[PDB]
């Protein structure tokens, strides 16, 4: 929040913003520049106030009006920015249902409290439980892992550290995998879904005291396929959530064109949470800024919108 790139605008005036956006929408050809400039420089909560004031004045819902007025990747970004975080995450989950990397990315990186609100909003929008949908769309151990993660019931022992449990969990992960001939997948799932993220960072550290390979290397040796890929993503997300996002951003822009669904989703969803840490990890790893990469990979008003969500560079 302190680590978000998008901050609450000072001296906020919803009605001013709604008049200005209406004018922009009705400009011949559409004044996209103004729409992007405003909405990318307001908090999500402020955008809700703007939507409310817009409908009151015009008798049109802002999101509907913008669906009609905008298109292409610009439209995706702007409509995503208008959704509340829970609505946005719920709708991105639904869209990922199959895209296992994206389901992990969303589910691994939200708080318990965000996950409860996502579950509630998902049922409301889609009239089915998120967990029922996951069970439908997935199978085997990846289904078990996803179901467990989606419940959003990681332990929350403030950060009162339990050094004994850290050690026991680390030994248990080792005994369940690298120490023995097969792999006890339910034990890995249990530990990695039921403990807090800070606890698990310490477990993975302590783990190295017992295992000749770190957690990521152990995963590579112990499991295969979709489930291997899922655990690797999950462990990265736990060990360093900003670097995880930075790597997903870099990968979204590599080579020819862009995986715009991923890029958009990250820039919208992490804009008010940790985009400054993501930037910092990205620059540290890749040498140039996130801003520089977005700028080289996208164009037009869509690019401008994403560069505002990035927020600049250091
Ligand atoms: Ca235009
Ligand atoms: Ca083994
Ligand atoms: Ca590219």
Swiss-Prot record:
<dbReference type="InterPro" id="IPR018252">
    <property type="entry name" value="Annexin_repeat_CS"/>
</dbReference>
<keyword id="KW-0272">Extracellular matrix</keyword>
<dbReference type="GO" id="GO:0065010">
    <property type="term" value="C:extracellular membrane-bounded organelle"/>
</dbReference>
<keyword id="KW-0677">Repeat</keyword>
<dbReference type="GO" id="GO:0005768">
    <property type="term" value="C:endosome"/>
</dbReference>
<dbReference type="GO" id="GO:0004859">
    <property type="term" value="F:phospholipase inhibitor activity"/>
</dbReference>
<dbReference type="GO" id="GO:0005829">
    <property type="term" value="C:cytosol"/>
</dbReference>
<dbReference type="GO" id="GO:0005544">
    <property type="term" value="F:calcium-dependent phospholipid binding"/>
</dbReference>
<dbReference type="GO" id="GO:0005262">
    <property type="term" value="F:calcium channel activity"/>
</dbReference>
<feature type="repeat" description="Annexin 1">
    <location>
        <begin position="12"/>
        <end position="83"/>
    </location>
</feature>
<keyword id="KW-0041">Annexin</keyword>
<feature type="modified residue" description="Phosphoserine">
    <location>
        <position position="159"/>
    </location>
</feature>
<keyword id="KW-0106">Calcium</keyword>
<dbReference type="InterPro" id="IPR037104">
    <property type="entry name" value="Annexin_sf"/>
</dbReference>
<feature type="repeat" description="Annexin 3">
    <location>
        <begin position="164"/>
        <end position="236"/>
    </location>
</feature>
<dbReference type="GO" id="GO:0070509">
    <property type="term" value="P:calcium ion import"/>
</dbReference>
<dbReference type="GO" id="GO:1905602">
    <property type="term" value="P:positive regulation of receptor-mediated endocytosis involved in cholesterol transport"/>
</dbReference>
<keyword id="KW-1017">Isopeptide bond</keyword>
<keyword id="KW-0832">Ubl conjugation</keyword>
<feature type="modified residue" description="N6-acetyllysine; alternate">
    <location>
        <position position="28"/>
    </location>
</feature>
<dbReference type="GO" id="GO:0043231">
    <property type="term" value="C:intracellular membrane-bounded organelle"/>
</dbReference>
<feature type="cross-link" description="Glycyl lysine isopeptide (Lys-Gly) (interchain with G-Cter in SUMO1); alternate">
    <location>
        <position position="28"/>
    </location>
</feature>
<dbReference type="InterPro" id="IPR018502">
    <property type="entry name" value="Annexin_repeat"/>
</dbReference>
<dbReference type="GO" id="GO:0031982">
    <property type="term" value="C:vesicle"/>
</dbReference>
<keyword id="KW-0597">Phosphoprotein</keyword>
<dbReference type="InterPro" id="IPR001464">
    <property type="entry name" value="Annexin"/>
</dbReference>
<feature type="modified residue" description="Phosphoserine; by PKC">
    <location>
        <position position="5"/>
    </location>
</feature>
<keyword id="KW-0111">Calcium/phospholipid-binding</keyword>
<dbReference type="GO" id="GO:0005886">
    <property type="term" value="C:plasma membrane"/>
</dbReference>
<comment type="subunit">
    <text>Heterotetramer containing 2 light chains of S100A10/p11 and 2 heavy chains of ANXA2/p36. Interacts with ATP1B1. Interacts with DYSF. Interacts with COCH. Interacts (via repeat Annexin 1) with PCSK9 (via the C-terminal domain); the interaction inhibits the degradation of LDLR. Interacts with CEACAM1 (via the cytoplasmic domain); this interaction is regulated by phosphorylation of CEACAM1. Interacts with APPL2 and APPL1; targets APPL2 to endosomes and acting in parallel to RAB5A. Interacts with S100A4. May interact with UBAP2.</text>
</comment>
<keyword id="KW-0007">Acetylation</keyword>
<dbReference type="GO" id="GO:0005509">
    <property type="term" value="F:calcium ion binding"/>
</dbReference>
<protein>
    <recommendedName>
        <fullName>Annexin A2</fullName>
    </recommendedName>
</protein>
<feature type="repeat" description="Annexin 2">
    <location>
        <begin position="84"/>
        <end position="151"/>
    </location>
</feature>
<keyword id="KW-0964">Secreted</keyword>
<dbReference type="GO" id="GO:0012506">
    <property type="term" value="C:vesicle membrane"/>
</dbReference>
<dbReference type="GO" id="GO:0005634">
    <property type="term" value="C:nucleus"/>
</dbReference>
<feature type="repeat" description="Annexin 4">
    <location>
        <begin position="240"/>
        <end position="311"/>
    </location>
</feature>
<feature type="cross-link" description="Glycyl lysine isopeptide (Lys-Gly) (interchain with G-Cter in SUMO2); alternate">
    <location>
        <position position="28"/>
    </location>
</feature>
<dbReference type="GO" id="GO:0005604">
    <property type="term" value="C:basement membrane"/>
</dbReference>
<feature type="modified residue" description="Phosphotyrosine">
    <location>
        <position position="174"/>
    </location>
</feature>
<feature type="modified residue" description="N6-acetyllysine">
    <location>
        <position position="202"/>
    </location>
</feature>
